[PDB]
Amino acid sequence: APKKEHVNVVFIGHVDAGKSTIGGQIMYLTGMVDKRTLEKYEREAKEKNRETWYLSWALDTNQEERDKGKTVEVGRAYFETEKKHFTILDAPGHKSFVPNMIGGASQADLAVLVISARKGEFETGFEKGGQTREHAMLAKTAGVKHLIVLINKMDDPTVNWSIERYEECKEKLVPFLKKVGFSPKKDIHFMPCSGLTGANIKEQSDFCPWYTGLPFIPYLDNLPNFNRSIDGPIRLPIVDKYKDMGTVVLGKLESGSICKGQQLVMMPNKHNVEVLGILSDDVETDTVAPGENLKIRLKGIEEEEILPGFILCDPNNLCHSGRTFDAQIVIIEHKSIICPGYNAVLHIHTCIEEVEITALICLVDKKSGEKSKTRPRFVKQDQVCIARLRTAGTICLETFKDFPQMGRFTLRDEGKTIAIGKVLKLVP
Amino acid sequence: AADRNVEIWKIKKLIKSLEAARGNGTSMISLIIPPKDQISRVAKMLADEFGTASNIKSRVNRLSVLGAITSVQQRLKLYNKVPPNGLVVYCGTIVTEEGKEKKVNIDFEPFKPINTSLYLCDNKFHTEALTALLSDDSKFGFIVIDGSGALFGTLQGNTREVLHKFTVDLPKKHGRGGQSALRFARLRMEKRHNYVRKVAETAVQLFISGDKVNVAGLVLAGSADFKTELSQSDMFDQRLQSKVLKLVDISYGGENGFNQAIELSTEVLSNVKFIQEKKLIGRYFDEISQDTGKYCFGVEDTLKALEMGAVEILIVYENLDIMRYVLHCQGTEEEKILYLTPEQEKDKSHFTDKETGQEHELIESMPLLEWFANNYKKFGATLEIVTDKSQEGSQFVKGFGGIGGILRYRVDFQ
RNA sequence: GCGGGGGUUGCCGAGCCUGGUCAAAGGCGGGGGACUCAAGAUCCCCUCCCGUAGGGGUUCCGGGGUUCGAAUCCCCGCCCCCGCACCA
RNA sequence: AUUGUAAAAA
């Protein structure tokens, strides 16, 4: 009988964008957290002299996070609208913590890009040093295709629902998104809000008459753009590990359905393992269909050295792996020379493994897909080519042509992005 | 300086080609007579050695050991005194390529004084002492902190080496909007507390030997908040705290963030000075990123480009079977100067690549780095002999061929 | 610092108190040998530099003075060691 | 009234 859909929603934002504050509202306004709880959050924050974080302390959990008003470890919280069940993902407001940010990006399908409009906070977000770049290269890398752009901090001293700041946000993002992750101009939705007062999250503001579109909680519910459910022999990338009620494992069901009490096997590992209890998204299930962010209690031979960034797989039809591969790379800002023997760290899904380019194949154009018939010394900025790649150890991969969320990769070195990679031939 | 490039090349050669000097039995004497000793004392103690090796056991081993004490006994009376550098002698008999046998008799005076003594007869020569002649730049320690674990390692030259590393578990669940701070504090205020403790433990176990830091200093690499707690700790206090060269804010940990901690700390180590060579392979690369043209790569371009002007830096790779040959011409009374590798060289009739097949007659052959060492100052300013162990090093050898130059003008190429 | 006495050939030490009869006794050590397989006692030869014929050259700390002539006679310098004492 | 190392037993 009637099921509400299980998908997560993720908040990617400027460092100071109030990703926690909007979180705190959206649970309160859907009743998921009690009045008593808001009173206690008010009190604990005041007593340690932290007034303007009352809502933020709902998502900011750790000490350094509460203190500064933005996350460092990934945070998960459950709320329920009229059509769906959500787990909402606060992704770190600090930038040294990219492993918590990739696991937040990975569980998406849907990503909400939260931009602060405040003078100082807005402009700084679109620089190289901001978090907007690192967040857009991750959403594209995780499969995101409908971007929700939420303009926060809009009822503030220096913003009076400024249509000019709002237009500045839109205008700046269409080329910035188009450049960093190859986004098209459309499948983008804009909405002004404020997180501190909750303006335009559930009810319409009268400080803002010019925006007569839907608020955030009525919208998000009624958005049709969800592409999560994938039939096939079954696949789970591990996104998080932790002990609570038994040992628990979190990931996205990126192919098929896994029933309670049954074998998996892990990969490349080949580690036999049985489910003990299934919480799909954040409620108990015994059956669980594809596309749902799984939170499984496991029983295995190992349970505390269990590594994130490898797959669980069918026991039954286990799954492709490398450690040698050919791939298309596209050189956005090394910005200098890559020739053969170049190294970097490799992001696919929740993996972050070292990699080196063995031999360099051929040059390829952006247009038509057409390769050169000769082979080069090297490649430079704004070109594209095909290269052979060895990882340090062994990763499990699909081809981009198989499934792009296990195929699309990011060449990470410094706090920058050198190329966006597309795996073509899995060797051996 | 250009004269010490040649010395190091010689020493590399010498070192390798004295292990490749293997024999059998105890026919392979290594003798190192230290600064200003007593010629007669040594020569006598070798007549005491010949006397006991006149038993020794096993026929051909006797007779060969005798003939190899005899070679030194005769030549050691040539010397008037033990020079200030001492005498290093290596006498024996070795099998070489094609399973052929050669009586090897070496006796020299090290360029820099030898600081060790040794009379030892194995079935190969000993080469460990000659490493001390070129000696050290250091040798840094690297602590890599991350919220999943930590890693103890060193960087000596361009070589990252991993000495030790452990992983930590933290419960990443604290509630769902109604956050339990008893879940926050309970296990973490002891995981984190014991972890800065164990970092300081595994820093004192690994980076301190004989009451002193073995490495020259520590570079500390880490994610936020875990390192300003570790640096200023009382657990890290005393000797480690006073050897903190630089810190580094990094985006990842482990071996991934061991690389990123050198990228960021490059010029503060310094002088490593192999790291600074990797920087300068950086600088060659980002000439080649631009239209300004002071770059060349490969043999061909690079070569004619050194011939018709001058390089500021001439950058060559340490191992390197490419050599300068001078071939006369088959027609006689004309000649060719060509660069070959072991494969082309085996076709002694053409001495060239199989696809061309051109006829030649070789007269002399100088190793391409040795030829360069002996003329870099008449063809440019500065020479760099370079390693492959760094990501810039790796690239030089793989996709330029371990040969190129930063010129003093705008060149053009094929 | 002030004095006093010393520095010899590879080393140690005579001989220098006897200026020409000192290229320097002796010991130890080195080198060559016999000794009878090998050491190695014992003994013999050689042992400042240079030189084809016992020739040339240079010595007794460095450098001068006096003498036809000084390693040997007189003075200064450096260096060493020793007392006593202001200061070190 | 000296000193002498390394792979032999159907």
Residue numbers in the entry:
A (entry chain B): 207 to 634
B (entry chain A): 7 to 420
Q: Paper's wording?
A:
Eukaryotic termination is mediated by two directly interacting release factors: eRF1, which is responsible for stop codon recognition and triggering peptide release, and eRF3, a GTPase that strongly stimulates peptide release by eRF1 in a GTP-dependent manner (1–3). eRF1, in turn, stabilizes binding of GTP to eRF3 so that they form a stable ternary complex, and is required for eRF3’s ribosome-dependent GTPase activity. eRF1 has omnipotent decoding capacity and recognizes all three stop codons. It comprises N-terminal (N), middle (M) and C-terminal (C) domains. Domain N is involved in stop codon recognition. eRF3 consists of the essential C-terminal region comprising GTP-binding (G) domain and β-barrel domains 2 and 3, which are homologous to elongation factors EF-Tu and eEF1A, and a non-conserved N-terminal region that is not essential for termination. eRF1’s C and M domains interact with eRF3 (15,25). eRF1 and eRF3 bind to the pre-termination complexes (pre-TCs) as an eRF1•eRF3•GTP ternary complex, but peptide release does not occur until eRF3 hydrolyzes GTP.
The advent of a more powerful classification algorithm, RELION, prompted us to re-examine the original data set, resulting in a much higher resolution (9.7 Å), which enabled us to propose a more detailed model of the interactions pivotal for peptide release. Classification of the cryo-EM data set comprising 195 432 particles of the mammalian eRF1•eRF3•GDPNP-bound pre-TC formed on mRNA encoding MVHL tetrapeptide, followed by a UAA stop codon, yielded 10 classes with different factor and tRNA occupancies. One of these classes (25% of the particles) had P-site tRNA along with well-defined eRF1 and eRF3 densities. eRF1’s N-domain reaches deep into the decoding center, establishing multiple contacts with the 40S subunit, including h18, h30, h31, h34 and h44 of 18S rRNA and ribosomal proteins rpS30e and rpS31e. In our structure, mRNA occupies its normal position in the decoding center, and eRF1’s N-domain interacts directly with the stop codon, primarily via the TASNIKS58–64 motif, consistent with ultraviolet cross-linking of the stop codon to this element. The TASN residues appear to be close to the first position of the stop codon, I to the second and KS to the third. The topology of eRF1’s M domain is now clearly visible, folded back onto eRF3, with the GGQ loop close to the switch I region, similarly to the interaction between Dom34’s central domain with Hbs1 (40) and aRF1 domain B with aEF1α, whereas α-helix 8 interacts with eRF3’s domain 3, close to the conserved GRFTLRD613–619 motif.
